[PDB]
Structure formats: structure tokens, C-alpha cells
């Protein structure tokens, strides 16, 4: 094979080749109009056709990053719009590509889409193919690390909603409830993908490799270790390419793995027949959301192969990761009730056991009791679930988010205000997703979602590092972030921020902004309130909130709102400064 660009074009097809390139251009340059990206895709698509016809043509043998970076460099508004990004084109490959990835903005500050069904159903009937591309460009631009093959899946499921709803008598009643249930699934899928790339770039290939061992052995307990390692090797490669910008190699390798899984169902799992009958994009998504398989009937006891064996040390030193991956496989297949975050926590703790036990003269007496130490790790988080869920039912979602806003602001005051608000909102959403679930299967729920939300706090904070407490928990370990953040305490080393009148100034626009925007504004002032008064008790903060609610209710109803906010505004500040002094 001499032409990489022709190999990807023939395997994926024109439609999927064009979409994946549009996604790639959207993640690299997030401040560019949609029309300009269509031109870059069309030009690169025409070049791809030429290489398939004639492979010996000049330029067909270059790497996919070279051709990609070459087109990114011809953007006339590279410097004036992206600043220092224009200096990436002054280097060679692969340093040129690494320079580009480093400029992916995880907070693109892009406008919020307010979709109305009238004009939205109109653009779909006008051009379904462009309305399809507009969704890809819009999602990829706000999530520059999105799993690209799944972006095409959601894009086709997006037209499918309009396919069925733009024909009914009430388009609004049909479209909005479907896209909202889909809006939460895409943000969930983006946060999961954002954590996978973070594992590689910050904790190494071994981190993502062990991630798949936990999930795969959990979902496929019947598959033997040699089969699980085969899938792990190819899946880690697939994700490694997507997280590295090789979207064409990523999707093509996902299809090959989706095909390999179906052609070996009898050795992997018995619940894939329905999954292995859908089209390419739907099939790959089915395998990712498939139910777990049944546990074998006569599994040998765990203690046999890694505790009572007089060769645990010997087997470990000859193949450390392979023996440890074996321990994760044996443990994940028998405990599908646990969280993936808990399994990697059990294996990481077992790793630390062998390293210190084999160092002793008689490791046998040292490592023989590891089973008791590991079992105690499962019960440590259990106490936090009850307390959080009880506070959830009492205050509700909104009252819980403001509760977490208070708890986490005193915990890490140095973190910027918009990050503290947005994170605490996601933390409050966890209660609605987990405490209502079975208390005998919810245990992973909390631990699972918390690892995806705390990762975003690290991702947001690593851009502009300002808090010493956040940096430690984010770089110490990947699996122990949740206990590292719950164990943090409000430190008396933080000096309260000086008072800012603007941070407590409000206009009549508070009565107009959308509901989400209204809450954000009210929650922003709550963060800045505690940043200035870090020692305000709960009874005082209770009084201030009720004083503000009755206030905003008063001024949003007067015939002259600006005069109400002008007069009553200073009144609240004096009363609040008096109660908090
Ligand atoms: C403030 O000025 C804004 C300018 O921004 C430019 C961004 O600066 C970054 C650092 N940097 C500095 C200089 C250059 C250009 C060198 C050059 C180019 C074309 C040339 C063509 C020639 N011909 C044969 C006609 C002869 C010499 C050339 C020499 C590029 C980048
Ligand atoms: C590079 O790879 C990583 C490094 O490998 C490290 C792996 O070490 C050996 C792991 N291991 C392998 C096999 C077994 C079970 C054996 C067994 C089976 C049936 C049995 C039937 C019996 N009956 C009489 C009914 C009696 C005993 C039996 C015993 C346990 C542990």
C-alpha cells in the first residue's frame, strides 16, 4: 500500500469520508464558518478521487496529517482569528500536528443553539444532506474531542427525528422531546470520550488499556482472556487514533472491530445476534450499549490464582501488565455489579500490594491477605451515597445544585466562577440519575458519572491552572480522583476576595433571559458570594437566598423594573453585608 488517502476513501465510502473530514476540520478550527469548511472538504474530497483513479499521482503518498495540515495552513484568516495557532505551520510533521491539537478549545464560548421547529423543519426539507452536515459541524465545533464514528451515528439519528416529525400536524410536540432526550445522550457521550483521551495524554496507554479490560470482561464474562486481550488491543488502537485526530483510521478500524466481534459471537457473547444485524453505524453503537452476559456457573474461587499460589511473585515479574490485566479480567467477569472505576481501583491497589510484598523476604505471608484489604475498598464510598441522596430528595435538583455550589466553593475557592457553577450543576444532576435507581445497582452509577464530570473540572483547570488542590487530585491518579475530591476540606489558607459591586449588580434582563440562563446568573452570584465571605454559615446563606428570591419576585412584577432594581438593589447589599459581617 502506497496511498493512505486512497485506502481510507475506498473503505469508508464518499459519504462517510466527507462527514469525517468535516468533523476533523470542525474540531481543529472551531472559529470558522460552516461554508468555508465545506470548501475545504470538497477540495480534499476531489483530491481523494484523483488518488483512487491514479495512485502514482503527486501527493497521494503523503500521510493523512500532511495533507490535512497543508489545507489548514492555506486559511487566509489563520493568524487574525486563531492567533499563535498560525505558528504551527512553521514546523514539520508530526510537530505541526501536535501544535494544532494543543489549540483545541475545550470551552469554545460559542452561542447556545435555540432550535425552533418551524425554520428547522424547513432547512431539513430544503436540503437533507446539508442539514445533515450542519449538525456534524455544530456538535464537533463545541466538542473538539468527540468520538467521530459516533458523531455520524447521532447525525443520522438526528435526521430520523425530522424524518418522522416534520410530517405530523404538530412539529413542535414531536421534535423537541426527541431532540432533548438526544441532547443529553450526546453530551454524555462527549464527556465519556473526553475522559478516554485524557487517560492517554496524561496517564499513558496502560491507563486506557486497563479501562477496556474492566468494561469488556464485565460485558463479556464468557470470553476467555486471550479473546478479551485481542479486543482490548484493537479497541485501544481505535480510541488512540480518534483522540489523536486520525478520524479516518479511527472509523475504518471501528468497522473492522465491529465486523470481527460479529464473526466470533459464539466465543464472545450470546447477546449479540440482534446487535449484529443492523447497518454499520447502528451495529457499532449496539455493541457499545449491549447488555452484560451471564456469569459462568462453575467459576473457580478468586483466591486460588493470585493469593494462595506460591508463584504469584514469579508470575508477576515475568509479565507485570499481563498478570495484572489477568487479575482485572478475572475480577471484572465475576462482579458486573461494580463500577468500572471501582475495578481499576481494586487492581491498582493490588498492584501496590505485589510491589511491596514481593520486596519483603517472605511475600507469601504479605500478599495472602490482600483479599480482605480489597473487600474493604467497596464499602468506603457507600456512606457518601446515602448522605448525598437524602440531601437530594429534601432540596430537589435546583436546591441540591446550590447546595453543592456552597460545598465546593469553600473547598477550592481559587477555581474560576464559571467553572465552579457549571461543574456543580452537573454534580447536582447526578442525583436525578442515580439515587432513584436500584440501591443494588446504583453503586456504580454515582461512581461512573462522577469520574466523567470531575475529569471535565481537571480538563477545564489544566488550561488555566490556579488551584493547588485541583492540580494535585487531577495529576496524582486517574482512578482515585473521586475520593481525592471528597476528602478535601475548606482550607483556612485562602484569603477572601475583595468586594466587587459589579459581581452583585443586576438589571431588568434577569426577568427576560431563558430559564437555564436565569439559573446560571443566580448561581454565579452565589459562587462570588462565598468567594468573598468563605465563612458564611448555612443559616446566613439560607437568609440571603430567601431575601433574593422575594426581591427578584418583587422587581420583575413592577411597572418600572429598572427603577425597582435601582432602588431595592442597594437595599439587599446593605442587609447582606450586615448579616454576613
Ligand atoms: C509584522 O508583520 C507581519 C508579518 O507577519 C508574519 C508572521 O510573523 C511570524 C514570523 N515571520 C517572519 C517573517 C516571515 C516571512 C518571511 C518571508 C516571506 C516571504 C518572502 C518572499 C520573498 N520573495 C521571493 C518575494 C523573499 C523573502 C520572503 C521572506 C514569516 C514569519
Ligand atoms: C502470561 O500470562 C500471565 C501469567 O500467567 C499466570 C497464570 O498462572 C497460572 C494461573 N492458573 C491457571 C490454572 C488454574 C486452574 C487450574 C486447575 C484446573 C482444573 C482443576 C481440576 C481439579 N479437579 C481434580 C477437579 C483440580 C485442580 C484443578 C486446577 C489456576 C491458575
Q: Nearest to residue 201, comparing CAs of 332, 339, 340, 104?
A: 104
Which protein residue's CA is at the shortest distance from atom 19 of ligand 2?
300
150: left (phi over 0), alpha (psi -120 to 50) or beta: alpha
User: Would you call 319 helix, strand, or coil by DSSP?
Assistant: coil
| Nearest-10 crossing angle of helices 538-555, 561-579 | 170
- 252 has binding-site annotation: yes
Radius of gyration for the chain, computed over Cα atoms and rounded to the nearest angstrom? 27
- Residue/partner pairs of 86-93 with CB below 8 Å, 24 or more apart: 93/63, 93/65, 93/66, 93/69
Count Cβ atoms below 10 Å from residue 448 Cβ, excluding itself: 18
Residue 160: alpha-carbon gap to chain centroid: 25
Q: How many Å lie between the centroid of ligand 2 and the Cα of residue 211?
A: 25
The span from the CA of 18 to the CA of 43, in Å, is 10
Is there a binding annotation on residue 244? yes
Which 8-state DSSP code applies to residue 399? H
From the list 120, 140, 142, the residue with the least C-alpha distance to 131 is 120
Per DSSP, the three-state class of 535 is coil
320 lines ligand 2 (CB under 6 A): no
The DSSP symbol for 62 reads S
29-41 as b/e: b if 16+ CB within 10 A: bbebeeeebbebb
Residues 377, 339: contact at Cβ < 8 Å? no
**Grid cell digits, residue 509:** 434582563
469 closest CA partner among 447, 449, 491:
491
- Cβ contacts of 208 within 8 Å, gap of 6 or more: 196, 199, 200, 236, 239, 240
* CA geometry: angle 223, 227, 232, nearest 5 deg: 110
**In angstroms, rounded to a whole number, what is the distance separating the alpha carbons of residues 448 and 581?**
41
Asked if residues 283 and 258 have their Cβ atoms less than 8 Å apart, the reply is: yes
Q: What is the DSSP string of 68-118?
A: HHHHHHT-TTHHHHHGGGGGGGGS-TTHHHHHHHTT--SS--PPPP---HH
Cβ count near 539 (within 10 Å) = 8
Ligand 2 atom at minimum distance from 322 CA = 3
d(CA 8, CA 170): 43
Run of H or E residues at 49: helix 34-53
Please state the atom number of ligand 2 nearest to the C-alpha of residue 323: 3
The CA–CA distances, whole Å, from 181 to 160, 161, 177 equal 14, 11, 6
Which atom of ligand 2 approaches the CA of 305 most closely? 31
Sorted by sequence, the CB contacts under 8 Å of residue 181 that are 6+ apart come out as: none
- Ligand nearest, relative to CA of residue 88: 1
Query: Rounded CA gap, 461 and 463, in Å?
Result: 5
4 assigned ligand-binding residue: yes
- Cβ atoms of 261 and 272 within 8 Å: the answer is yes
- In whole angstroms, what is the distance from residue 310 CA to residue 322 CA? 18
246 is known to lie in a ligand binding site: yes
- For residues 23 and 140, is the Cβ–Cβ distance under 8 A? yes
Question: Which residue bears the cell 428547522?
Answer: 120
Q: What sign has the CA pseudo-torsion 115, 117, 118, 122?
A: positive
CA dist 261 to 287, 356, 427, Å?
9, 39, 36
Q: Which grid cell is 319?
A: 509479565
d(CA 192, CA 60): 35
Which cell numbers in the block locate residue 162? 425530522
Q: Which of 100, 131, 122, 108 shows the shortest CA–CA distance to 19?
A: 131
Check pocket membership of 188 for ligand 2, CB cut-off 6 A.
no
Which residue's CA is the closest to the ligand 2 atom numbered 15?
305
> Which class for 311: exposed (0-12), middle (13-18), buried (19 or more C-beta within 10 A)?
exposed
Q: Which of 367, 331, 354, 58 is nearest to 221 (CA)?
A: 331
Q: Give dist(CA 275, CA 258) in Å, integer.
A: 10
Cβ pair 30, 141 in contact under 8 A = yes
11 is in an annotated binding site: yes
How far is the C-alpha of 466 from the C-alpha of 444, rounded, in Å? 31
The Cα–Cα gap between 410 and 494 comes to: 9
The DSSP call for residue 382 is H
Cis peptide bond upstream of 82, omega within 30? no
Determine which residue's CA is closest to atom 12 belonging to ligand 2. Answer: 305
For residue 224, which of 329, 331, 337 has the smallest C-alpha distance? 329
Determine the Cα–Cα distance for residues 189 and 354; give it in Å rounded to an integer. Answer: 36
Per-residue cell: 572: 439587599
Alpha helix stretches (DSSP H) within 78-224: 78-82, 95-101, 117-126, 128-142, 148-165, 171-203, 205-219
In contact, 121 and 175? CB cutoff 8 Å: yes
3-class SS of residue 152 = helix
- In sequence order, what are the residues at sequence separation of 6 or more whose Cβ sits closer than 8 angstroms to the Cβ of residue 60? 2, 3, 5, 6, 50, 51, 54
Nearest to 187 by CA among 433, 395, 364: 433
For the chain, how far is it from start to end, CA to CA, in angstroms? Answer: 74
Nearest to 68 by CA among 39, 19, 12, 28: 28
Q: Which residues contact 236 (CB under 8 A, 6 or more apart)?
A: 205, 208, 209, 212
DSSP secondary structure code for residue 3 in this structure: -
Measured over the CA atoms of residue 444, residue 445, residue 446 and residue 451, the dihedral's sign is positive
- What span, in angstroms and rounded, lies between the C-alpha atoms of 316 and 307? 12
147 grid coordinates = 468520538
Under 8 Å between Cβ of 344 and 328: yes
Q: Which three cell numbers stand for residue 276?
A: 449484529
CB of 473 within 8 A of CB of 457?
no
Residues 6+ apart with CB under 8 A from 318: none
> How far is Cα 487 from Cα 481, in angstroms, rounded to an integer?
10
Block residue for cell numbers 495540515: 69
Cα separation, 452 vs 221, in Å, equals 25
Domains in the chain, CATH or no CATH each: 2-105 (1.10.246.10), 106-194 (1.10.246.10), 202-293 (1.10.246.10), 294-379 (1.10.246.10), 380-491 (1.10.246.10), 492-569 (1.10.246.10)
DSSP string, 433-461: HHTTS-TTTHHHHHHHHHHHHHHHHHHHH
Residue nearest to atom 13 of ligand 2 (CA): 305
C-alpha pair distances (Å), 400 with each of 229, 405, 412, 443, 550: 42, 8, 18, 19, 20
Say yes or no: CB of residue 321 within 6 Å of ligand 2: no
What gap in Å lies between CA 19 and CA 8, rounded to an integer?
13
Alpha carbons within 13 angstroms on the beta-carbon side of residue 528 total 16
Phi, psi of 496, deg, nearest 5: -60, 140
Nearest to 175 by CA among 134, 126, 110, 123: 123
Q: Does any ligand 2 atom lie closer than 6 A to the CB of residue 299?
A: no
Provide the CA 259 distance to its chain's centre, in angstroms: 26
Amino acid at each position: 500500500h502506497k496511498s493512505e488517502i486512497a485506502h481510507r476513501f475506498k473503505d469508508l465510502g464518499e459519504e462517510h469520508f466527507k462527514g469525517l473530514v468535516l468533523i476533523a476540520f470542525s474540531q481543529y478550527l472551531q472559529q470558522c464558518p460552516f461554508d468555508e469548511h465545506v470548501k475545504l472538504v470538497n477540495e480534499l474530497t476531489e483530491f481523494a478521487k484523483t488518488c483512487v483513479a491514479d495512485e502514482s499521482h503527486a501527493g497521494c503518498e503523503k500521510s493523512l496529517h500532511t495533507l490535512f495540515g497543508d489545507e489548514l495552513c492555506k486559511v487566509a484568516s489563520l493568524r487574525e482569528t486563531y492567533g499563535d495557532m498560525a505558528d504551527c505551520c512553521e514546523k514539520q510533521e508530526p510537530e505541526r500536528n501536535e501544535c494544532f491539537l494543543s489549540h483545541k478549545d475545550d470551552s469554545p464560548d460559542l452561542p447556545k443553539l435555540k432550535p425552533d421547529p418551524n425554520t428547522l423543519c424547513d432547512e431539513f426539507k430544503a436540503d437533507e444532506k446539508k442539514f445533515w452536515g450542519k449538525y456534524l459541524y455544530e456538535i464537533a465545533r463545541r466538542h473538539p474531542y468527540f468520538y467521530a464514528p459516533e458523531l455520524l451515528y447521532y447525525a443520522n439519528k438526528y435526521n430520523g427525528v425530522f424524518q418522522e416529525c416534520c410530517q405530523a400536524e404538530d412539529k413542535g410536540a414531536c421534535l423537541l422531546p426527541k431532540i432533548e432526550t438526544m441532547r443529553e445522550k450526546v453530551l454524555a457521550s462527549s464527556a465519556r470520550q473526553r475522559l478516554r483521551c485524557a487517560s492517554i495524554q496524561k496517564f499513558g496507554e496502560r491507563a486506557l488499556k486497563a479501562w477496556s479490560v474492566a468494561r469488556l470482561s464485565q460485558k463479556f464474562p464468557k470470553a476467555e482472556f486471550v479473546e478479551v486481550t485481542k479486543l482490548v488491543t484493537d479497541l485501544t488502537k481505535v480510541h488512540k487514533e480518534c483522540c489523536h485526530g486520525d478520524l479516518l483510521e479511527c472509523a475504518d478500524d471501528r468497522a473492522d472491530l465491529a465486523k470481527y466481534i460479529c464473526d466470533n459471537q459464539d466465543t464472545i457473547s450470546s447477546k449479540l445476534k440482534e446487535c449484529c444485524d443492523k447497518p454499520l453505524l447502528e451495529k457499532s453503537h449496539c455493541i457499545a450499549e449491549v447488555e452484560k452476559d451471564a456469569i459462568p456457573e462453575n467459576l473457580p474461587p478468586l483466591t486460588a490464582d493470585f493469593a494462595e499460589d506460591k508463584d504469584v511473585c514469579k508470575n508477576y515479574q515475568e509479565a507485570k501488565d499481563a498478570f495484572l490485566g489477568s487479575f482485572l479480567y478475572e475480577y471484572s467477569r465475576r462482579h458486573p455489579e461494580y463500577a468500572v472505576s471501582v475495578l481499576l481501583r481494586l487492581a491498582k491497589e493490588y498492584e501496590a500490594t505485589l510491589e511491596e510484598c514481593c520486596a519483603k523476604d517472605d511475600p507469601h505471608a504479605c500478599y495472602s491477605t490482600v483479599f480482605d484489604k480489597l473487600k474493604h475498598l467497596v464499602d468506603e464510598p457507600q456512606n457518601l451515597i446515602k448522605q448525598n441522596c437524602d440531601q437530594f430528595e429534601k432540596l430537589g435538583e435546583y436546591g441540591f445544585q446550590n447546595a453543592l455550589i456552597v460545598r465546593y466553593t469553600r473547598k477550592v475557592p481559587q477555581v474560576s466562577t464559571p467553572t465552579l457553577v457549571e461543574v456543580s450543576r452537573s454534580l447536582g444532576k447526578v442525583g436525578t440519575r442515580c439515587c432513584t435507581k436500584p440501591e443494588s445497582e446504583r453503586m456504580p452509577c454515582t461512581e461512573d458519572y462522577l469520574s466523567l464530570i470531575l475529569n471535565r473540572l481537571c480538563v477545564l483547570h489544566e488550561k488555566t491552572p490556579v488551584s493547588e488542590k485541583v492540580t494535585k487530585c487531577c495529576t496524582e491518579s486517574l482512578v482515585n480522583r473521586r475520593p481525592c475530591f471528597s476528602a478535601l476540606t475548606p482550607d483556612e489558607t485562602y484569603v477572601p476576595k475583595a468586594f466587587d459591586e459589579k459581581l452583585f449588580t443586576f438589571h431588568a434582563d434577569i426577568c427576560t433571559l431563558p430559564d437555564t440562563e436565569k439559573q446560571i446568573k443566580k448561581q454565579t452570584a452565589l459562587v462570588e458570594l462565598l468567594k468573598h465571605k468563605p465563612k458564611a454559615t448555612e443559616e446566613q446563606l439560607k437568609t440571603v437566598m430567601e431575601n433574593f428570591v422575594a426581591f427578584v419576585d418583587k422587581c420583575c412584577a413592577a411597572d418600572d423594573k429598572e427603577a425597582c432594581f435601582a432602588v431595592e438593589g442597594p437595599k439587599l447589599v446593605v442587609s447582606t453585608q450586615t448579616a454576613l459581617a
